[PDB]
Design a protein around this ligand. Sequence first.
Ligand SMILES: O=C(O)Cc1c[nH]c2ccc(Br)cc12
Length: 126
Amino acid sequence: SVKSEYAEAAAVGQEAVAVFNTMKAAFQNGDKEAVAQYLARLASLYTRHEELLNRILEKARREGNKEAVTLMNEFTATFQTGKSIFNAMVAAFKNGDDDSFESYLQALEKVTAKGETLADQIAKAL
Ligand SMILES: O=C(O)Cc1c[nH]c2ccc(Br)cc12
C-alpha cells in the first residue's frame, strides 16, 4: 500500500539521520576521510528518499487523496530546502570551508527538525 511505502521511505529518512549524526561527529573530530564517505552515503540516501516520496505523492494524486496530496506537496517542497542546504554543505567540504560547513550543517538540522510534525501527519493521512 501507499502507507507501507511511506513507512519504507520514512525508515530511509531515519537512516539518513543516523548517518548524518555520525557524520557531524566525524566533522567535529576533523576526520575528513570519514566525512567524505558519510557524504557519499548521505547523497545516495537522499536520492533514494526523494524518489520514494515522489512515488508516494504521485500515488496519492492518482487515488484522489486531496489531504495527503496537500501535505506531501508541502513536505516535498521542504525536502528540497534540506537537499539544497545539504548540497551547499558538500560544496563547502570540497572547498575546505569549515565555517560554511558548520553553518550549513546546523541549518540542515533545523530544517529537518521543523519538518517532523508534517512527516508524522503524512503517515496518518495516507
Ligand atoms: O530527500 C528528498 O526528498 C530530497 C533530497 C535530495 N537530496 C537531498 C539531500 C539532503 C536532504 Br535533507 C534532502 C535531499
